[PDB]
TrEMBL record, chain B:
It comes from the Bacteria. The gene is BbLPS1.16. Pfam families: Epimerase (PF01370). Belongs to the NAD(P)-dependent epimerase/dehydratase family. The lineage of its organism: Bacteria, Pseudomonadati, Pseudomonadota, Betaproteobacteria, Burkholderiales. NAD(+) binds at residues 17-18, 38-39, 41-42, 60-61, 80-82, 99, 123, 141, 145, 170-171, 192. One of its GO terms (molecular function) is nucleotide binding. This is Putative nucleotide sugar epimerase/ dehydratase.
Length: 336, 335
């Protein structure tokens, strides 16, 4: 049913970003009529927005009142991917997080509530689906903002029939995640965004991979192209008011991540890994991909090896530009 | 309670119903100073006493200049501001967010630097658990109240802000003024809650608009008990903790109406129906046992006594209450 999006008008809030740019690429592949990207480039690079006849780019916050007022009821689908990137940035400035991570969703939904052409509004939430949450689980304002967007998604559906679908995912990696993308957001994580691109960049430079705690921790990585397809499946076939895990169902240890990256890149430097013991990942739960498979026919099948090969090829091909982007934060990094 | 003697206290939302009662009790307790911060969005200035120990900032707590001007000179902060209430919030979720979610966040973001604070008490909505459903929330107001609990837990864990969440519901008593504040979009601005609506109507000798035979029950709690409960939270509540401040006693709306009529001498009819098992089934009231055990707090004002006090206050102030109600006449007529 991904062809349901053929010849439709789509908005992608946060569409200049990592997941967003990949979603935009896939929408254009599927033959959408128009993509309206709304993105303030707070954590993104304009090089991730194509200069394409189906792509309209509004370089403005989705909280901007004038922008919101200017929106017309001409969208079939909306993908809400904006966030304040990410955990560490949000701890550093909870008010910057609120503006770009909680208020975004509320103001977007308040404008959309009277749009009648809307078939689905897909919200990227953070990471068997249950709708019970703990007040204690939340390590950052980012994590609270993500949860709050689910509260809003449920409310706008119940009260106003906004056809929301919540897509939960975690540990996305792949082409288009640029270290240093966007503005300085307070901490070194602006540069070193996530473990996979940090390790790829370091391995391409022939640097030893800074492996923490022997790399015993595991993550369910998911390739960004699979996430894009999962978000599309939610739009086309997800139940309004509903939620879906968009997940690989496969765990990789950080040590094995490092090893694969080193092997593919030919980075012949040491790795300080340790054997996993029963106490190392004992509490850990990963999201089941079963609901999305059963109800949407969606399966995230790109293997970690194939995904890493693609990501590494893209990173190598763009290494100079990535480095120019990272370097803009040299001063802020030095004084942190 | 006397732990607060001679302390400096801030009451955000201190001009409102619960707030004004809390401020009165704090003064009785002999606090050094109360700083009330209130934009009067749902409140009346006559609920702010002229008293040498009260300072009044007629300003939103989200105002940056006000926040920046605050100094680390408070022993206790009571955060009572909200966007009153469910109905208003549904009408305008953005007005709610500004006065109900953003309030908490910006307040906490300022206070996290303050090391004189012993306790920060947040009035949340109604054994205590910290698990919530994404589905339980009928309104933006409801979401904002829950969000404030999330923030309270976070700021304690991350920044050691000594928060205590106080959960209550169905407060009634002197100082709740029908029509208080600005028009917030719906007739609930006037007809705020069932108790003051019924008291007012009974005093005017009008039939009480009892809905569905009054089979619904509520755990009403008298406002002075809520104020003492908040104080017990401040003095002795565990940082990061939560306590139900509750009566543990249910009254049907039909019995509420009957009592109000009996006290006021309102001789008009009442359409009551008998309560059946399927009428309140599964409705849960908050246990007051944790607050009793840990803080020695119990809410002992009976419904009969509280209603008497409330009716007396209303009768005493009926003229001013009506003048306050009447400012919303045009807005009511067009709703
Ligand atoms: N990458 C992951 O592993 C991961 C995991 C779980 C959930 N998510 C969610 O997926 C979404 C996309 O994340 P990402 O990894 O692509 O990060 P990203 O930072 O690359 O993308 C987010 C985009 O939002 C934009 N933005 C920020 N504030 C805005 C505002 N006020 N108005 C409009 N646009 C704004 C940024 O400039 C950026 O382009 C986010 O909602 C994120 O929380 C991501
Ligand atoms: N009355 C009840 O039965 C009840 C039940 C459960 C929880 N509560 C909570 O108790 C607290 C007090 O409620 P109340 O019944 O006294 O209502 P209220 O409306 O009388 O008091 C709230 C006060 O907050 C003020 N306020 C609004 N926005 C503000 C802002 N931006 N900055 C500063 N002040 C602002 C209002 O002007 C008002 O004086 C609220 O937090 C409410 O959610 C009340
Ligand atoms: O430079 C890095 C960055 C992260 N990680 C590991 O990668 C996992 C996920 O990283 P995140 O920063 O998201 O926490 C954790 O187990 C980290 O210890 C690592 O070994 N080296
Ligand atoms: O004018 C009124 C206002 C409310 N109620 C009842 O009082 C209870 C609580 O009212 P609320 O407005 O809080 O909902 C409910 O069972 C209502 O039906 C009523 O009978 N008449």
């Amino acid at each position: 049913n991904a062809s349901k999006l053929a010849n439709t008008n789509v908005m992608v809030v946060g569409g200049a970003g990592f997941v967003g740019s990949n979603l935009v690429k896939r929408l254009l592949e599927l033959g959408v009529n128009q993509v309206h990207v709304v993105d303030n480039l707070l954590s993104a690079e304009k090089i991730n927005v194509p200069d394409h006849p189906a792509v309209r780019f509004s370089e403005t916050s989705i909280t901007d009142d004038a922008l919101l007022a200017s929106l017309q009821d001409e969208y079939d689908y909306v993908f809400h991917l904006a966030t304040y990137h990410g955990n560490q940035s949000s701890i550093h400035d909870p008010l910057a997080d609120h503006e770009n991570n909680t208020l975004t969703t509320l103001k977007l939904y308040e404008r959309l509530k009277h749009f009648k052409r809307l078939k689905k509004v897909v919200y990227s939430a953070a990471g068997e689906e249950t709708d019970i949450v703990s007040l204690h689980n939340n390590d950052s304002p980012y994590s609270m903002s993500k949860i709050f967007g689910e509260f809003y998604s449920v409310y706008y559906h119940k009260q106003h029939q906004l056809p929301t679908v919540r897509a939960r995912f975690q540990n996305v990696y792949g082409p288009g995640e640029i270290l240093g993308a966007g503005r300085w957001r307070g901490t070194p994580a602006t540069v070193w965004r996530n473990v996979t691109p940090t390790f790829i960049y370091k391995a391409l430079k022939g640097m030893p991979l800074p492996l923490e705690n022997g790399g015993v921790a595991t993550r369910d990585f998911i390739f960004v192209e699979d996430v894009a397809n999962g978000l599309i499946a939610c739009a086309a076939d997800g139940t309004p008011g509903g939620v879906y895990n968009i997940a690989s169902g496969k765990e990789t240890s950080i040590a094995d991540l490092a090893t694969k990256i080193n092997e593919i890149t030919g980075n012949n430097t040491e790795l300080d890994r340790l054997p996993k013991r029963p106490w190392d990942n004992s509490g850990k739960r990963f999201g089941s991909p079963e609901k999305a498979r059963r109800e949407l026919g969606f399966s995230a099948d790109v293997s970690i090896d194939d995904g890493l090969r693609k990501t590494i090829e893209w990173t190598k091909a763009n290494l100079a530009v990535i480095e120019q982007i990272m370097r803009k934060h040299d001063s802020a990094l030095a004084t942190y």
